[PDB]
Amino acid sequence: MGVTKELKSPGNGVDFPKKGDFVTIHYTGRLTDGSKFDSSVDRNEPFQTQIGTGRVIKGWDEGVPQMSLGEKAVLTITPDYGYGARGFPPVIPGNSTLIFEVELLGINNKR
Amino acid sequence: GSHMGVTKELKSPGNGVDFPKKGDFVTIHYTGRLTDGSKFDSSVDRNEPFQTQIGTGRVIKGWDEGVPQMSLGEKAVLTITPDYGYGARGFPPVIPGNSTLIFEVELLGINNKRA
C-alpha cells in the first residue's frame, strides 16, 4: 500500500518494534530521481523516536515495526504515507515518493 | 529548541528596489543547515538555482514570508521554525529530529529580472 518494506540484511528475526517502543535507526532518504534529501548516517548521529504513536510519517510508523533488530531494509513510501501533496519545498517537493535506506540499531534497551 | 517563526539576517544588500511580490516566479540559490551547522540541502551543490513561485504556498510558510522581504541580489539567512504541520513542534519532523531549519538564501532573479 502506502509503504512497502524490502529486506536487505536480516536481523535477529525475534525482536520487533511494538507500539510505544523507542526505536533507534540510521537512515538515508532519496527522491525517485535518486537524489538524497536527508541522512543521519552522514551526520554520524542515529535517530531515536517512539514508533507506535504517530510521531513520524506513517511510512515509518508502519514500515519500521516490520523490521527486526539489526535489520537493513528499504522503505518505499508514497506521498500519502509521506509528506503528502504539500510536501516541504524546497526540502521535499510536493507529491514526492520517498525511498529510505533504514537500519534498525535499537529497540528500547536491546541494541 | 527555542526558536519560533522566522528570523531574517541581512548578509549582503540587493539593489534595494526590486522585491518579490505575490505570484512572482523567483530564482534562488540556497543552502539548508541545522542549528549545529550541518548541511542537509543545497542548490549550490547541485549547480542549479532553485526556481519557484512566491507567496502562493508552493514553498513553506517561512519562505513565503522571508523571500518577499529581500531585494534583487540580496544575500540573507532565514532561521525558520514552522508554526503548523510537518516539521513543527508536536508534528512529525521533516528533518528528524529538528523543528528549526536555517536557510542561506541568495535572491538571484525576480521573473525575468536578474541580479
Author numbering:
A (entry chain A): 1 to 111
B (entry chain B): -2 to 112
Copied sentences from the primary study:
The 12-kDa FK506-binding protein (FKBP12) is a ubiquitously expressed peptidyl-prolyl isomerase with considerable homology between fungal pathogens and is thus a prime candidate for future targeting efforts to generate a panfungal strategy. PPIase proteins all catalyze the cis/trans isomerization of peptide bonds N terminal to proline residues in polypeptide chains. In addition to its role as a PPIase, FKBP12 is a member of the immunophilin family and is the target of the immunosuppressive drugs FK506 and rapamycin. Three extended loops, which have been called the 40s loop (between β2 and β3), the 50s loop (between β3′ and α1), and the 80s loop (between β4 and β5), surround a deep active-site pocket that binds both FK506 and rapamycin.
Sequence alignments revealed that A. fumigatus FKBP12 contains the same proline residue in its 80s loop that makes intermolecular interactions in the C. albicans protein. Thus, to deduce if A. fumigatus FKBP12 might form a similar self-substrate-like interaction, we crystallized and determined the structure of the apo form of the protein. Remarkably, we observed the same insertion of the 80s loop of each subunit into the active site of the other subunit. Interestingly, unlike the C. albicans apo FKBP12 structures, which were all captured with Pro104 in the cis conformation, in the A. fumigatus structure, Pro90 in one subunit was bound in the cis conformation and Pro90 in the other was bound in the trans state, thus potentially providing a snapshot of self-catalysis.
